Design a protein around this ligand. Structure first.
Ligand code: OGA
Ligand code: MG
Ligand code: NI
Ligand code: ZN
Length: 331
């Protein structure tokens, strides 16, 4: 068995290997990359996402979210308070202001220590889930707006034609902006490209050990667990690496820098934080190996998780027994 310790693997495809996206994901899995839940892909030196980032300031962040924490430093939840619209240029200036800017630090490990010590005492503002793309239309390799759609994959594997679309999303971050512990909708893959700015640190639990994380989360968040049998779908709970180590939960960590791709694999729980002003683009995708994970994915039916139009068909076709309860949660 390849990668039996479930380490995060880093890949350096050549320009030739960067042509066929599906083929390279299958290659990475042949080497055991999915066992970690997360992989890093460094593009060949010949590749670029677009020519420059000099003209992005007029993009609108219609609903910036202030991420307010409750709990203790290593075990907390966050809620998202809606703020007034602002442009990317306005948001960048805010991220760089004395109130929000990255503190002085020695290296990524010192910054990580400062994040876990001090995150809860601040409320950073995140531009999340903005439909759109920063890939040039002429970029033909690993262009996250030109991937094969999940609806086409389901149709190719299973024969059923379904409604829905699959488009990318932009994220504008600042110091301490935080992504809570989660797997993707329907335990899909994700791919994330860091277009510009400061790094993103990731934490990940191997898919084979995801239920260990869920059992810890039920212990640590006992009211939330009573409320919903899949409350991590709400995307609000944080648990630090120190707490994970104290409870014996297997995990790994890695820092993504600008110009790098990360892939999350089906049922790989992940969480993390941004180091400073940055912009990422991400989208979900599927492969044949996903189908069995989609059929088994948990679902939130309490009303909190509320998701895209296109998840309807995935539930309806892969999980018909759960469909009526889940749809009631959507309504
Ligand atoms: O970058 C972020 O805030 C969160 N991204 C992801 O969870 C992802 O790409 O799957
Ligand atoms: Mg612009
Ligand atoms: Ni994710
Ligand atoms: Zn729920």
């Amino acid at each position: 068995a390849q990668n039996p310790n479930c380490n995060i693997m880093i890949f350096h495809p050549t320009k030739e290997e960067f042509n066929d996206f599906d083929k390279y994901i299958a290659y990475m899995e042949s080497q055991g990359a999915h066992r970690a839940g997360l992989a890093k892909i460094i593009p060949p030196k010949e590749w670029k996402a677009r020519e420059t980032y000099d003209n992005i300031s007029e993009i609108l962040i219609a609903t910036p979210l202030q991420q307010v924490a409750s709990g203790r430093a290593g075990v907390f939840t966050q809620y998202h308070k809606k703020k007034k619209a602002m442009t990317v240029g306005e948001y960048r200036h805010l991220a760089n202001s004395k109130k929000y800017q990255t503190p002085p630090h020695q290296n990524f490990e010192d910054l990580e220590r400062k994040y876990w010590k001090n995150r809860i005492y601040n409320s950073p503002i995140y531009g999340a889930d903005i439909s759109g793309s920063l890939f040039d239309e002429n970029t033909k390799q690993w262009n996250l707006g030109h991937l094969g759609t999940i609806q086409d994959l389901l149709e190719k594997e299973c024969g059923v034609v379904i409604e829905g679309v699959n488009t990318p999303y932009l994220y504008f971050g600042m110091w301490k902006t935080t992504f809570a512990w989660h797997t993707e909708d329907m335990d899909l893959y994700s791919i994330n490209y860091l277009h510009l700015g400061e790094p993103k640190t990731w934490y990940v639990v191997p898919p084979e050990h995801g239920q260990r994380l869920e059992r810890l989360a039920r212990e640590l968040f006992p009211g939330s667990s009573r409320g919903c049998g899949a409350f991590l779908r709400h995307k609000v709970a944080l648990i630090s690496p120190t707490v994970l180590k104290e409870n014996g939960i297997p995990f790994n960590r890695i820092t993504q820098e600008a110009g790098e791709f990360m892939v999350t694999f089906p049922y790989g729980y992940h969480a993390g934080f941004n180091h400073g002003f940055n912009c990422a683009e991400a989208i979900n995708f599927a492969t044949p190996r996903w189908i069995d994970y989609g059929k088994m994915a948990s679902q939130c039916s309490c009303g909190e998780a509320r998701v895209t139009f296109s998840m309807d068909a995935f539930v309806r076709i892969l999980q018909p027994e759960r469909y009526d309860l889940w749809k009631r949660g959507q309504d």
